[PDB]
Symmetry: D2
Subunit: 277 residues, 4 copies
Amino acid sequence: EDICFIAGIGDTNGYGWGIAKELSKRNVKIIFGIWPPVYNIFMKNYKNGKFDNDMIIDKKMNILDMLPFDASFDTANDIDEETKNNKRYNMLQNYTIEDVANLIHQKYGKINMLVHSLANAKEVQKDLLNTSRKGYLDALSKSSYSLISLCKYFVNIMKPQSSIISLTYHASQKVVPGYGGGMSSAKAALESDTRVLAYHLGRNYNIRINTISAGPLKSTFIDYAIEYSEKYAPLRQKLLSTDIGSVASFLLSRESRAITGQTIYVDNGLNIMFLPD
Amino acid sequence: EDICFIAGIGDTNGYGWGIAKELSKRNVKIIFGIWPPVYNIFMKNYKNGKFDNDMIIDKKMNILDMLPFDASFDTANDIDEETKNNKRYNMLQNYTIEDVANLIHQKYGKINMLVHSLANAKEVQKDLLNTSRKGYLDALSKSSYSLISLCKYFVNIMKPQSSIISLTYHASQKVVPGYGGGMSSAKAALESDTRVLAYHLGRNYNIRINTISAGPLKSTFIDYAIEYSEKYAPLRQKLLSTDIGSVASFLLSRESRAITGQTIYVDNGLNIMFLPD
Amino acid sequence: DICFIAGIGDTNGYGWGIAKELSKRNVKIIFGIWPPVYNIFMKNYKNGKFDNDMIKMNILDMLPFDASFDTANDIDEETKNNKRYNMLQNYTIEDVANLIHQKYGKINMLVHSLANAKEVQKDLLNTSRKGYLDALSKSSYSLISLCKYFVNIMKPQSSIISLTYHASQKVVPGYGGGMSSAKAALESDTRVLAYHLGRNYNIRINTISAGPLKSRAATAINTFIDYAIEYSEKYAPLRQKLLSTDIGSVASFLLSRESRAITGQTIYVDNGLNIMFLPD
Amino acid sequence: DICFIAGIGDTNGYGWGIAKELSKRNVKIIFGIWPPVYNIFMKNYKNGKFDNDMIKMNILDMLPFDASFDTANDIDEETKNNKRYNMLQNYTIEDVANLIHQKYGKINMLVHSLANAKEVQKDLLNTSRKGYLDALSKSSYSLISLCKYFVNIMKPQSSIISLTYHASQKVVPGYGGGMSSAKAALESDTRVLAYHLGRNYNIRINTISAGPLKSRAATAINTFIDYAIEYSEKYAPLRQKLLSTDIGSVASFLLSRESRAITGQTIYVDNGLNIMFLPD
Ligand SMILES: NC(=O)c1ccc[n+]([C@@H]2O[C@H](COP(=O)([O-])OP(=O)(O)OC[C@H]3O[C@@H](n4cnc5c(N)ncnc54)[C@H](O)[C@@H]3O)[C@@H](O)[C@H]2O)c1
Ligand SMILES: NC(=O)c1ccc[n+]([C@@H]2O[C@H](COP(=O)([O-])OP(=O)(O)OC[C@H]3O[C@@H](n4cnc5c(N)ncnc54)[C@H](O)[C@@H]3O)[C@@H](O)[C@H]2O)c1
Ligand SMILES: NC(=O)c1ccc[n+]([C@@H]2O[C@H](COP(=O)([O-])OP(=O)(O)OC[C@H]3O[C@@H](n4cnc5c(N)ncnc54)[C@H](O)[C@@H]3O)[C@@H](O)[C@H]2O)c1
Ligand SMILES: NC(=O)c1ccc[n+]([C@@H]2O[C@H](COP(=O)([O-])OP(=O)(O)OC[C@H]3O[C@@H](n4cnc5c(N)ncnc54)[C@H](O)[C@@H]3O)[C@@H](O)[C@H]2O)c1
Ligand SMILES: Oc1cc(Cc2ccccn2)ccc1Oc1ccc(Cl)cc1Cl
Ligand SMILES: Oc1cc(Cc2ccccn2)ccc1Oc1ccc(Cl)cc1Cl
Ligand SMILES: Oc1cc(Cc2ccccn2)ccc1Oc1ccc(Cl)cc1Cl
Ligand SMILES: Oc1cc(Cc2ccccn2)ccc1Oc1ccc(Cl)cc1Cl
């Protein structure tokens, strides 16, 4: 009985979903953490059967639960009155990082797989030089610190030899004009933090953590990235969300017990190239 | 007539000073940017001649000016009332990043060298896993975004083929337990941002930017780092603030016109080692 | 699913651990064995020495294999006539490719699990040209050539792995003879190969940077491995003992279709030691 | 201040640009010249061809030098008797070391500015063992051996540099013959050497990863350099044209005492091209 919490899904079109699908093959029970502002929409679509085709594995994806989850709030203490008043949030509760860990632990006990699959930058459209302090720190808060806080709070509800992964992108290491707003900065911090966290979690809890540097998925510039990737990557096949999924599944399993602190590239090998051929 | 603004000095015991000294050999005019809370102390010591020995180059260090400078505020607009009221700040003015660029430009015209030499993390003593969101973002704000904002505002007051450097540390790339509070995260972001900035500044202004990854200088754990470095680094000599200074001088000169976006290690080669010998 | 494992000489190394793990997924294993140790390995197999170690493997075949030789024409007269090669046939790279293809058809998995350097005991500065080139020939070029001849007997979408060590990237004094150089070249060649193999053949290639394991080869170095192992178990983020099957299950994953979007990569399987700068 | 420059054959490469820049700081330059091009280089010197290019250099000496040979005993009979070596003496590595020491005493600067690969035109997968080993011997081992023999005729706190190319780290199709492999090994060897040289000799060693320059060697590759240059001038963060003196002033800095705390490093002098992932 393995249970994985996936923080950061909004539809079946991203990595979170591809990871849920592949894990389901291993009979892993899935819990979704969903950004409150799209939680109700997601529940509706799910109810209206919009995801039924997406859920087929002759095996059904076993979704144990779907919970509102906001990566920018650590505890009930951090909720500002403007979101308290806020339309969407008003009718939802217990969606802070610590609140969700308590809920899950209470309802289902300890888990052993954790997926951080979320990024947000309010100024992702502006290049770095034109990003505001507010926009930059928002990017870091939502995309980088959220990983640390996730680990801080979920470690108490995880079994020993548990495993954790996040998703990153090569803009951290090499220049991708157009990946702005401090998203590149956020990814660089996330990959560094993955190492620092791997040391602490490894020594203190025997828990592993790694990150997957993924190629482009259509989930503007994304159309460029995907086209360029499919033209110039070593491997011609289309990169599927389940290509990341099967890698994630392996990193979350005990088959990878000796791998931690790593950035693992799942991008058809595009990262290895220097000049177009 | 070359002029360099050095943001982030508080005494003659750090890299900023070593960089000022070496630049002075090249007859570069120096302007110091000093954290307001220690500005007056610094001025006093300077007046009381405490730095006279430190200033000798048979050449005097030519300090063109010394200005209060706070890396956490971008413009006059960002000054919160608590600092406005604040003792130290109350008797100082025009210390925001944009304010200082305007002052310098007004008093002295355009400059062609910029040094970012500052780091601060309010929770540097806590390890990453135990760092608060507030502490983490403060680290990023002061140590990383400050570089971007410095470039944003000083580029308008710099000549073409100007040059910029900052200071970083290898904890960004490899684990150094004890370098906490998100300082490691901040350095990783700074090294990544150095590349992104190098592209923008290079293409749009023909300005270069690089960062120096420095070994330990006594400016607790620092005593460990220095001892370990002196035991295990390829080069036995003591690492001097002027070892960083002479490298900085070269990176800021036109002798390095074809180098940009780089992290340059000035650490007696310690970075190259895996296991102690 | 058939895998050729090039470079196994006993049950104490990574090759055996890889064999073991691939067997679990019902992969057919073919051993390529260096002729100097070929006979003794055979003898121990039939005399059931490895029986405790195979806990049961599916060993399709065991062939003489020397990665120094690309084709039969490359075998020098002395080696040809040597006591231990006497006496043996079809052990070059081209020859084992052909032989394997005749017996079994096309395969889909390849493991390069070998390395050799005559002067490993010398530090780099003191290595001769001859010793250095030997290291690169046996440890690095052998991979390139293995690929060249096996790509024709491999299907799409097959997978190739090799084994490397972090001394290529960071200084490990005592890892001498140009072995550091050979691992650096091999990690670079893995990228270049991943490009050509991916484009032209839809074949994948990656390399595993393993942590210390007390193997035959590891002892060839003048207690270095004992210190290595002991240091890793003390300072690695993960303090479990590193097993050859830890690498093996990672090898199995890389060779399987589950890793179809990974290529050209150096993957560290070393309890995380590589991420550390300063000892604790 | 005396610098030996190993690997100059005309005024169109990095060696010349390095010579030029070192002259500016009043450094005494000794050229080591490959015997195949030794005579013509001499002839052009006295016939004032390079006069426009030396705008005045301080050329202390010009010696025959072949980095394929470690000692006189390494010279094969054919080479020994060849039309172009006929006729020449003391051109091995040990021999030039000794010769330079006798004429001038100890030096404090060394530049490895050479590379060679018989099969550069072939892609890696199609390179023979012989071609690959040639690339590593001439381009990589030559540095190690240069160090071995020159450390005895160098003072503390002397400095050594070599030249490399980013194809070691990222795939550049067309950079064949094992040249990519040779650059990867050389960048690794630079670290290992920096350790031994720093500890035992207080001598520094670094390598410069240069951008494209239309040199003799660069054209040996089957328009590749023209595309390289054109691509760099279009996509590099800095759009100025990359000059051999751009590398030269960086070489001068690395060789001088101003860089006393830098060692084991790969320093990119390439208008920043290396930092880019996606074309504009
Ligand atoms: N798609 C790509 O080409 C690509 C490439 C590399 C990395 N990634 C990474 O993959 C991860 C998943 O993104 P994706 O591409 O699958 O798109 P996605 O929309 O499937 O995933 C991002 C999800 O994060 C959620 N989210 C946003 N703000 C949040 C908050 N404050 N709290 C909680 N959740 C929030 C959103 O609902 C969104 O669904 C991201 O971390 C992204 O950086 C994506
Ligand atoms: N000393 C080392 O061992 C070492 C190693 C690697 C990198 N570095 C880097 O070198 C740089 C200089 O630090 P140092 O070691 O010379 O110590 P330092 O005290 O000389 O430099 C840091 C200075 O930044 C100033 N500062 C702090 N908060 C500020 C703010 N909000 N606005 C403006 N200025 C502020 C302080 O007055 C302080 O003097 C830092 O960026 C540090 O990260 C130091
Ligand atoms: N043991 C470690 O700590 C360690 C760490 C990192 C990487 N590696 C790598 O793992 C691989 C396997 O080494 P190991 O540690 O398992 O030792 P091992 O002795 O078990 O494996 C090496 C095998 O290669 C064979 N071999 C040597 N030269 C050959 C040739 N010319 N032709 C064919 N076969 C030849 C030998 O017979 C030997 O059995 C090597 O590439 C090694 O560099 C080992
Ligand atoms: N040109 C470029 O675009 C470029 C880019 C990056 C790195 N580099 C490197 O710079 C260095 C110099 O190359 P270059 O581009 O200036 O070409 P070049 O032809 O000017 O320099 C190479 C020189 O090395 C000499 N040489 C070759 N084999 C030799 C041997 N066995 N003994 C002694 N001398 C020998 C040749 O006579 C030749 O003059 C090389 O290491 C090269 O890899 C060049
Ligand atoms: O983080 C992401 C990275 C890439 C890679 C990419 C896509 C297109 C062009 C260049 N790079 C694509 C999508 C990504 O998703 C996001 C982007 C911005 C934000 Cl604010 C949030 C997400 Cl989830
Ligand atoms: O940023 C710094 C890095 C090192 C390197 C080091 C020193 C000691 C032990 C380990 N690493 C030493 C001092 C540093 O200065 C700072 C550290 C924390 C802060 Cl909050 C600010 C500064 Cl300027
Ligand atoms: O690549 C290898 C790495 C280690 C780990 C190690 C060895 C020595 C010191 C520290 N760690 C052990 C053996 C390795 O492979 C070899 C190296 C040289 C030779 Cl000659 C043979 C082999 Cl199989
Ligand atoms: O290391 C080198 C790099 C470049 C730049 C380049 C060459 C080809 C394609 C793209 N860029 C040109 C020449 C280089 O050196 C050599 C490579 C092979 C040989 Cl045989 C000789 C030399 Cl000097």
